[PDB]
Amino acid sequence: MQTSARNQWFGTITARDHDDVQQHVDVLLADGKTRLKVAITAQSGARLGLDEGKEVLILLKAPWVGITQDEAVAQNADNQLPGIISHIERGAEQCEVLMALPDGQTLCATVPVNEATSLQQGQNVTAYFNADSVIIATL
Amino acid sequence: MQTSARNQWFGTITARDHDDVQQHVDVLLADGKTRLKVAITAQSGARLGLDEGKEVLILLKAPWVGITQDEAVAQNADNQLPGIISHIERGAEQCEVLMALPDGQTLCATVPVNEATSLQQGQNVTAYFNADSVIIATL
Ligand code: NI
C-alpha cells in the first residue's frame, strides 16, 4: 500500500446496512468526530468484513472532492468536510486545492481550472463528495 | 492489496506525462493488450514513481463503471472496454452488471436501475470510465 489517492484516512465502521446489491456503511474518522457515508457492493461488504468495529482506510481520489461555499450544495452531498483553503496551485486545465481540516490533516482536491477561479487561499469552504466516490481498504 | 474496489487489475505503466497539477499515465494491463488512461496528481506521480515499466494495480470501483450500448457514449469517455454481459443482478435502486472481458476476467459495474432497463445477459456492450476515475496502487 501506497496509492495515488491523495486523501487516505483511518476510520472505524459504526454501521452497515444489508441491501443485496449495494450497501452503505457509516465510518467514524481518526478525530473521533467526523462521520462519513460510503457505498460498496454487497459482495465487498461481506468479503472485507465491514461490520461495526472494523478498522479501515478511506481512499478518496482528489478529483472526487468538490469545493463549495453554499450550505445547500454541501448538505445535499453525502459527505461534507468544512475547513480553510491553505494553498492553491493553478495549472493549465486543473488546479490543486489544499484545505486544512481541524484534523491537522490536509485534504487535497483537483478542481477544473475554470471552476476554481473564484477559489482562493484563506477562504472558509466545505469539501464534499458522494458515498460512492470512496474506496474502503483493509490494512 | 485488499480494497472494496470490485475491479482490481494488475498492469504496467507505459508512459507518464509531466503536466504540473494533474498528469496522465498510460497503463498496459496484465492481459498484455488492454490499454488504460489514468489521471493522477503530479505529487502522486512522483511519490509512487509512476514511470515506464513500473508495475501497478488499477483500482476501479464498481459505480465508476458505466455500461453502454451507445458507441458515442463509449467513445466520449477516456477508456472503453467492449465485452459481453454475463450476468445482471437487479436491486431496488442499483444493479450489478457483470461483463466478460475478452481475456476472461469479469468486470463489475454498479448501475442505477433506470440505466440498466435495456441491458440483458449475452449482449454486446461497452464498459467506460474516465481517466480521473481510477486509482493507481503500488504492490
Ligand atoms: Ni497530460
Side-chain angles (χ1 to χ4, degrees):
Chain A
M1 190 144 279
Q2 262 309 297
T3 89
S4 67
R6 288 287 288 291
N7 303 294
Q8 164 172 328
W9 303 325
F10 176 81
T12 300
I13 302 315
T14 58
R16 181 182 158 205
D17 77 25
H18 297 274
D19 177 273
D20 271 355
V21 169
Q22 182 187 251
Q23 295 169 353
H24 287 258
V25 295
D26 288 338
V27 188
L28 183 62
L29 307 185
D31 58 11
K33 296 173 206 323
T34 306
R35 296 187 183 183
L36 301 187
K37 194 194 190 173
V38 180
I40 66 284
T41 60
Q43 192 183 285
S44 291
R47 183 172 68 263
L48 276 54
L50 305 183
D51 292 314
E52 297 161 9
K54 175 75 166 162
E55 290 182 343
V56 301
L57 285 166
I58 298 295
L59 302 185
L60 172 68
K61 199 188 164 77
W64 287 126
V65 180
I67 300 300
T68 186
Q69 290 189 298
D70 192 81
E71 316 53 27
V73 167
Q75 286 319 299
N76 287 341
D78 292 328
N79 299 293
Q80 51 295 110
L81 304 171
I84 301 162
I85 299 176
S86 64
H87 182 60
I88 301 177
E89 179 193 345
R90 310 286 174 183
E93 290 182 32
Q94 298 290 336
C95 297
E96 175 158 298
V97 173
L98 307 186
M99 182 194 196
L101 294 161
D103 218 296
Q105 281 188 133
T106 298
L107 169 153
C108 179
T110 302
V111 181
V113 60
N114 68 116
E115 302 180 6
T117 58
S118 54
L119 304 175
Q120 308 282 339
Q121 173 264 321
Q123 298 172 343
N124 307 274
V125 305
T126 300
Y128 64 94
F129 45 95
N130 290 358
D132 67 7
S133 289
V134 178
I135 285 169
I136 288 173
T138 48
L139 299 172
Chain B
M1 258 181 296
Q2 192 163 281
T3 79
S4 60
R6 291 284 299 284
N7 304 290
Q8 282 193 15
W9 305 324
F10 285 93
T12 305
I13 306 290
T14 57
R16 175 214 174 177
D17 70 15
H18 300 103
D19 315 342
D20 273 318
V21 167
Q22 184 182 72
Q23 295 168 353
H24 297 89
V25 296
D26 294 294
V27 175
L28 180 69
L29 295 195
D31 68 4
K33 187 191 176 182
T34 306
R35 296 196 186 265
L36 305 179
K37 286 63 177 165
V38 181
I40 71 290
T41 59
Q43 183 186 119
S44 282
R47 171 202 278 245
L48 293 191
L50 301 174
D51 303 307
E52 194 174 355
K54 180 76 187 175
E55 290 164 298
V56 291
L57 180 66
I58 300 294
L59 307 174
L60 172 66
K61 203 188 164 71
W64 308 344
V65 181
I67 300 295
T68 189
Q69 307 176 274
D70 182 341
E71 178 70 10
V73 171
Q75 298 305 313
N76 196 211
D78 304 315
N79 298 286
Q80 298 82 32
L81 299 179
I84 301 165
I85 300 179
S86 69
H87 189 252
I88 299 174
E89 188 72 44
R90 300 197 159 83
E93 278 188 282
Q94 300 292 334
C95 298
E96 185 160 291
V97 185
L98 304 179
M99 182 193 86
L101 273 331
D103 75 338
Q105 288 176 16
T106 287
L107 168 153
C108 179
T110 297
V111 179
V113 282
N114 76 88
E115 295 167 28
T117 73
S118 80
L119 305 167
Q120 57 185 56
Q121 184 175 155
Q123 289 190 316
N124 286 107
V125 299
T126 298
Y128 70 95
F129 50 89
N130 294 318
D132 65 4
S133 320
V134 169
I135 287 171
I136 295 171
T138 32
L139 315 184

